[PDB]
Amino acid sequence: MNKYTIAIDLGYGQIKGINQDNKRVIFPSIISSGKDRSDDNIVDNIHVKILDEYFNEKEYFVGELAKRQPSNSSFINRDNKINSEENKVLLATALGLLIPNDLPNDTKIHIVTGLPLEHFIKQKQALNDMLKDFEHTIKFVDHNFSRNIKFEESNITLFPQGAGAIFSKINNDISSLLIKETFIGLIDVGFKTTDIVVFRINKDKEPVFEQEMSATLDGLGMINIYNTMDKAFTDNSRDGSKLNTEQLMLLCEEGKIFFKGDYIDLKKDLIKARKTLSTNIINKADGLWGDDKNSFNSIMIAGGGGKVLYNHLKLIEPNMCQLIDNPEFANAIGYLEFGKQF
Ligand SMILES: Nc1ncnc2c1ncn2[C@@H]1O[C@H](COP(=O)(O)OP(=O)(O)O)[C@@H](O)[C@H]1O
Ligand SMILES: [Mg+2]
Ligand SMILES: [Mg+2]
């Protein structure tokens, strides 16, 4: 009785996913009501329908396709909720893309997912509850295929973020991380939260979680830069005009947007927002690691935020800190290695 393993990292910014055949998908965590659209990649054209027990077919665009719409799942103003309509569509769209076409009668889907470090205790059951209740057919209308998502209880496993990304053997060299009596830190800078997780290495090269030197920062993530640039845009505009989410996201890539025949350059505020977010995250990490900061052998930052802020984040200890090889799929790969050896 085999089982197929799909690792899915759920974010308030980007859904990341990878099954045990090393097929990865990633797309923005925005959905949108769908419509008859009337070597293109499927990930940029997610027109989809979801069938349930009520025989509701709910129609959605999700990902890049939904990003390019007037109506949107909020990005800034998406209330934090672990089981919602949008996390169900986003979870079922990531599954739908990572489920093969010829699974045997014996092979069933095993999902590995989780919560941020300190969010785990609070929301392990609510996430295990939404997964238990999955009873949906996900239909990719423009791509002639559909999948059924049903979860066998404890055909699913939940892991707090942090351990998996660290322990990994594809994005790390765990031979060089196993040093006696030293620490190893992770700084996963995400969209709404930021995880700081450290592990003490035993004298027998066994790693131990240090809850004390670890937190989940609830007010610091890349969303701070989005809001500061949203206010910088209306403020600079002095028109009372606001961007939509496709524009605001572009305005936070480089700080340039072409709006109503005006070249809006806010790169000066974007740089300041990134230094200001990065300062806080370095301060919190220093706050948790006192003089024990000298006892580290690596401090690896990761996530989408870690990728864009690495040059600021590195200042926390420049000759010792590094960027993990695939920052955004760093927890999702940890979720694969942990689920597969299970
Ligand atoms: N090329 C890029 N330029 C600027 N920002 C980026 C880029 N790629 C990703 N990001 C930022 O990183 C975020 C993705 O973070 P992610 O690793 O998904 O964390 P979470 O798991 O909390 O969603 C996006 O919302 C975006 O703001
Ligand atoms: Mg994340
Ligand atoms: Mg906290």
Author numbering: 1 to 38, 46 to 349
Paper text:
Functional ParMRC plasmid segregation systems comprise an actin-like polymerizing motor (ParM), a centromere-like specific DNA sequence (parC), and an adaptor protein (ParR), which attaches a plasmid, via the parC, to each end of the growing ParM filament or filament bundle. Here we investigated the ParMRC cassette from pCBH, a 257 kb plasmid that carries the botulinum neurotoxin type B. This ParMRC cassette is also found on other C. botulinum plasmids, such as pCLK (267 kb) and pRSJ2_3 (245 kb), which encode neurotoxin types A and F, respectively. Despite the similarities to actin, pCBH ParM is a genuine ParM, since it has a closed β-barrel, a feature that is missing from actin and MreB structures.
Using the E. coli R1 ParM cryoEM protofilament structure as a template, we designed a quadruple mutant of pCBH ParM that was predicted to prevent polymerization. X-ray crystallography studies on the quadruple mutant, using the cryoEM density map as a molecular replacement model, led to the 3.25 Å structure of the monomer (G-ParM), which was subsequently used as a guide to construct the filament protomer structure in the cryoEM density (F-ParM). Two of the mutation sites (Phe42 and Arg299), from the quadruple mutant, were observed to participate in intra-protofilament subunit contacts. The major difference between the monomer and filament protomers was the folding of a disordered region into a helix in F-ParM (F helix). This region is equivalent to the DNase I binding loop in actin, which is generally disordered in G-actin and becomes ordered to form a defined extended loop in F-actin. The nucleotide-binding site in the pCBH G-ParM and F-ParM structures contain ADP and the magnesium ion is coordinated by Asp9, Asp195, and Gln168 equivalent to Asp11, Asp154, and Gln137 in actin, suggesting a common mechanism of ATP hydrolysis in which Gln168 (Gln137) directs the hydrolytic water towards the ATP γ-phosphate for nucleophilic attack. Actin residue His161, which has also been proposed to be the catalytic base in ATP hydrolysis, is not conserved in the pCBH ParM structure and has the opposite charge, Asp202, indicating that the conserved glutamine may represent the evolutionary conserved residue important for hydrolysis.
